[PDB]
Design an enzyme around this catalytic site. Structure first.
Site, PDB file in Angstrom:
ATOM      1  N   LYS C 257       3.465  -5.154   4.102  1.00 47.72           N
ATOM      2  CA  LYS C 257       4.231  -6.225   4.747  1.00 47.72           C
ATOM      3  C   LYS C 257       4.124  -6.052   6.165  1.00 47.72           C
ATOM      4  O   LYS C 257       3.963  -5.066   6.780  1.00 47.72           O
ATOM      5  CB  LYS C 257       5.703  -6.410   4.284  1.00 47.72           C
ATOM      6  N   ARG C 331       7.246  -8.716 -10.217  1.00 51.06           N
ATOM      7  CA  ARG C 331       6.840  -9.429 -11.320  1.00 51.06           C
ATOM      8  C   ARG C 331       6.110  -8.407 -12.593  1.00 51.06           C
ATOM      9  O   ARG C 331       6.212  -8.654 -13.475  1.00 51.06           O
ATOM     10  CB  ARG C 331       6.281 -10.498 -11.045  1.00 51.06           C
TER      11      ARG C 331
END
Ligand code: NA
Ligand code: NA
Ligand code: NA
Ligand SMILES: [Zn+2]
Ligand SMILES: [Zn+2]
Ligand SMILES: [Zn+2]
Ligand SMILES: [Zn+2]
Ligand SMILES: [Zn+2]
Ligand SMILES: [Zn+2]
Lengths: 480, 479, 483
Positions: C257, C331
């Site tokens: 990120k 996920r």
């Protein structure tokens, strides 16, 4: 338009609809603190303001016994009262030292009313109309009167500048700047000349013209020249201002995040107009010339370009490598025109570089030039006026970074470091030898326009440069 | 190094395999210009150097009659001769006399330095000596004094430069400690080298946080040198950022900005060199050199944006960017420094890019509260030939390092004022009783530069060493 | 905590060191407005708070007659009072547009929430003098029984919320997966719940390799934890599985990120944290249902052992997953935890996750997304949740979005091939791991927006909000009503 009435009376006997009392350095012991217990109950410890409802006393904190913090506090106090329903407020006197503290107090109070709310549908006329000043020391009539004169002139001058700088760009065109300058000339019986692109062509001001080419057919440029000529002139002073009424970066287009607030790229030129108002109304003994180069820096099929090589009025050629370094081109030509006047002092004001802001922060202007005594005078006077300043030094290594392989000078540095100073060293290339020791460059890119309230400045334009240059001129004339 | 021999003779009578003559402000009129006509023919106008082949005379231009330009040309002249075949050069004496002689001898000596260890084509110079004819363009007294400074200061600078230039796989915190050990052994200094367990006992968790990613590879070192003379008029703490590599941490640097980060130890290295210089100069002050050494690496153990660190001083720090790591190391090193009750504290760090954006690559920033102290550092530093500028604090900037969930934030909420808000971050860890005894010097610019400039070869410069030495000498004069 | 005392008396005869009166819709006509003139003189027009100093009355404006704005104003009142010198405040009972019970819940919960702020690390932090609100059981416009019910709710929900918030607000060096297990253990002990804390070896034995892949980079520093809390009541009308993403820090992994986006990632454990708080609330409320709280806790770090773009992982469920971006890690952990959850054969499965940035771009920072197949179940969660004071929105699946998570070399891809529909395609990815027999029993709640916000809003202080707890609590209560 806060009226200040000076009265030979005690604070207690003076009559107003409410009271202002400063709490300096958390000292709650004075007689003027009527109900100390109330403050204890609601834990007012002297930070910010607090309104005693029963006694109608607004207390305003001043963290240290400091003239600059007093100016801020007075502004915050009147900002607060502007929202209330009292038509008048009385305040005692807080305090060379005496004069400077009264100037701070009166100027502080008056700037409390300012906000740029012209476009707000909910703008309300303030009920607050007067501050009654009881001439009695917290800890004279001649000083108050003098301080009040300064406060009225400086408030008027700053707000002129702030209103111009705040004006959105569809409205605040170069022509619009010239109109503001006309009003100021007419108000103070000044000589004014307003030149257009035809004059610029004649004087071979091709750097100035290049910046304007994209937008010439929409908003033509103006070279604005104000002159204040008094009875007695001890000095001849040229004040030169960047009037970029909008700067989109040109073909070197600014990113969206950085293009907002660029209506304030006329901060330097606007300050110069305000400075001629202030210096004429103070009646200083100097011939003062206010020179403003006004244009947009737009993008379009006629824009000047990276790779263009421009012949400045002085004669030196400029390799353009980035069209967002446009202020220094306009300034190169306006400084040339200034020098032709043979002034004793030249000061230029510009929202010139992002790198300055990165270096000093948003609240501080940079001072550059060769003459240390001159630079020190401007700094010391400026600091006292309540503006934040810092000198930035030239050096020979930085000078090398603006060389061009194909012109006399390049309009950007070859390095990503030192941008404000290499920008000042660009301007230097156009200062004749016989003016290098008479010249100051003030980069106000930071504090000229700030998107929050700070000190005595509302959101947006601040009028940066005006107080400082005024103080500078006054101190300069004391030696003359 | 360049041997400098002082001889009481005329320039003409002095003997060397070639001659060095300075041309000041394009004045070619002196007797030492042996063949003017040659220079006219080949259009030499006094910019840079020119070599009279037949007479074996190197001319070096000094654009103005200026001591700092003289220092620069002297360096350029020796750089030029280093590549030639002459074993010795003679030079006359150029002129206050003391500073001129200092400039001349220092500049000459620094002309030999190049970081060429890893070069396969490196040869040893033939040039070994400069014969200085003690004759103006007592004198011998000033000359011997300037030469002692020049020798100590060359040695000190080259120590700092070799260390900063040392590539990061080699130049570890332990490596820094070993260099400090050497300087302490040569100078009979007291030295303590503390590790992560000491840091832990002292609750220096801001320091430890920066090291966490790389703890198991290269452990951190707190280096403490002490010089204690017969006579100490002042106690002085010199505090250095020793980041031997800084990749940015989890807030990883773009590739373009990570090159040169071996020099993030410039401040810590300056301090090591300063104790060498100040001890050998025998200054009358107790000098403590404190260096916080660690890398700032990325890895699964790295400290993180959102970490809240308890500094040794006790104030809590919200970390929002792991690339503002220097001020965390210094926060704890300044706290350690203050326990020493020094009279003066100066810190040196390659702390901010914003400093560089602001002042340019060649100039360091001076921050603090005590104006008289900042002015002394600035004036003495400039005279030593380093470029400096003071940057002022203000109340508006101080607000920008506030945190909603800690006592202070390790970054500013604004894109503007970076070098200064970093200074104001450091200030939150300076106790009230030391705020007027404290200087912060940001040398992120000149500590390491990817070109030659002035008396500096490509790479490390030794920035801070000359300026602080002069500062200390001037300070002790008033004491 | 803010002690609330119910008192059988008039507002006027109740005693406290100060008073609170709400001003609704700029109407200053009520008798409790002791000095109406004062308010006029100082231009108080009903926006925000105003303190009648002499009478020691705090007015708090409520822009419309609305139960949600009442809750917000109560919170503001107590925030304002917290900084003053009054030990106690008295207030009457307000019944806005909800009903009496929901207005009582709003008032009591709002008041109690006004004290919260994450100030643990602040050196200046001080105890508030304000300790009690005296609630005078008198209408502004059985009352006692309803007030007792509302007070119990506000007490349990305040405690539950602050547990979640303290955990979410905890910085990542401290708030490790082990730390998350410890907080769950405390909750379990307090409520006499069953708790299992599984480590990496359990994950291995259950073939939870999506979960393990995310943890691989940091296994040697912070081992993962599969937390399984169990609430078992006498009478259970339903078995409910609550599944939470407990990413105690997400730097993005090898798909690192940007710096400006890595801040607040301590809050990537918001979903897991909400599940921990949900068991506290539901156990203490004594709901008639067997409730399972499943939390997949791990960091998503970068390092030489990190899982990679191009890795192909075999989920517990058996489906292979092409990884193309390591920052889609939540996920993967949820694929395996949902699988585990379905092994309990629950009647309802709700997962909570700070799952996608696209959700936040889509709905804004203050609103959570509801996904699933069962429209009626979706509506129950939305309606219940809105009434509880959370902002929510259903997002629809469609077959075109489903195609976008196809892989050329695996059964499914962990990211979409498109820049658009991120929150929904992530939900469709989760769907690939929901067995056919649970597809009508499953809700996916993306709380990526409201779980953590860097300003004060509504009843939430800077930072963690405890998003999801109120909504899910109300949803379970409504569900059990019909059962
Ligand atoms: Na600005
Ligand atoms: Na550098
Ligand atoms: Na969020
Ligand atoms: Zn521009
Ligand atoms: Zn511009
Ligand atoms: Zn860094
Ligand atoms: Zn660094
Ligand atoms: Zn992620
Ligand atoms: Zn995540």
């Amino acid at each position: 338009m806060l009226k200040i009435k000076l009265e030979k009376t005690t604070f207690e006997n003076a009559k107003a609809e409410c009271s202002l009392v400063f709490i300096i350095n958390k000292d709650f012991s004075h007689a003027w603190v009527k109900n100390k217990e109330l403050l204890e109950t609601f834990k007012y410890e002297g930070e910010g303001v607090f309104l005693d409802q029963e006694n109608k006393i607004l207390y305003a904190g001043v963290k240290e016994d400091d003239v600059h913090l007093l100016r801020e506090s007075a502004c915050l106090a009147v900002r607060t009262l502007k929202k209330l329903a009292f038509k008048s407020v009385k305040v005692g006197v807080y305090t060379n030292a005496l004069l400077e503290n009264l100037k701070a107090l009166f100027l502080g109070l008056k700037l409390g009313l300012y906000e740029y709310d012209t476009f707000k549908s909910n703008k309300k006329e303030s009920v607050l109309k007067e501050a009654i000043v009881a001439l009695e020391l917290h800890k004279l009539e001649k000083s108050a009167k003098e301080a009040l004169k300064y406060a009225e002139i400086m408030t008027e001058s700053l707000n002129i500048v702030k209103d111009l700088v705040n004006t959105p760009p569809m409205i605040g065109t170069p022509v619009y700047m010239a109109e503001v300058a006309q009003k100021v000339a007419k108000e103070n019986h000044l000589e004014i000349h307003v030149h257009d692109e035809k004059f610029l062509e004649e004087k071979k001001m091709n750097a100035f013209l290049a910046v304007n080419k994209a937008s010439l057919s929409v908003n033509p440029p103006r070279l604005i020249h104000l002159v204040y000529k008094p009875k007695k002139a001890k000095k001849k002073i040229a004040l030169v201002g960047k009037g970029l009424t909008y700067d989109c970066g040109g073909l070197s287009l600014k990113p969206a995040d950085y293009m907002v607030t660029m209506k304030a790229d006329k901060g330097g030129g606007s300050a110069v107009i305000g400075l001629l108002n202030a210096l004429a109304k103070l009646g200083v003994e100097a011939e003062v010339h206010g020179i403003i180069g006004a244009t947009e820096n737009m993008i379009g099929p006629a824009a000047y370009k990276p790779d263009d090589i421009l012949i400045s009025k002085e004669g030196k050629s400029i390799e353009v490598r980035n069209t967002d370094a446009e202020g220094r081109l306009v300034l190169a030509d306006c400084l040339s025109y200034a020098q032709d006047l043979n002034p004793d002092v030249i000061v230029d004001f510009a929202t010139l570089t992002g790198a300055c802001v990165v270096g000093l922060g948003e609240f501080t202007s940079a001072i550059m030039g060769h003459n240390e005594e001159l630079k020190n005078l401007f700094e010391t006077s400026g600091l006292e006026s309540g503006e934040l300043l810092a000198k930035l030094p030239f050096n020979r290594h930085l000078k090398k970074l603006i060389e061009s392989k194909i012109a006399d000078v390049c309009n950007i540095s070859s390095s990503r470091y030192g941008g404000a100073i290499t920008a000042g060293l660009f301007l230097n290339e156009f200062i004749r030898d016989e003016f290098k020791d008479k010249w100051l460059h003030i980069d106000i890119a930071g504090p000229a326009y700030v998107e929050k309230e700070w000190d005595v400045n509302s959101f947006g334009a601040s009028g940066a440069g005006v107080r400082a240059c005024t103080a500078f001129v006054e101190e300069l004339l004391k030696k003359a």
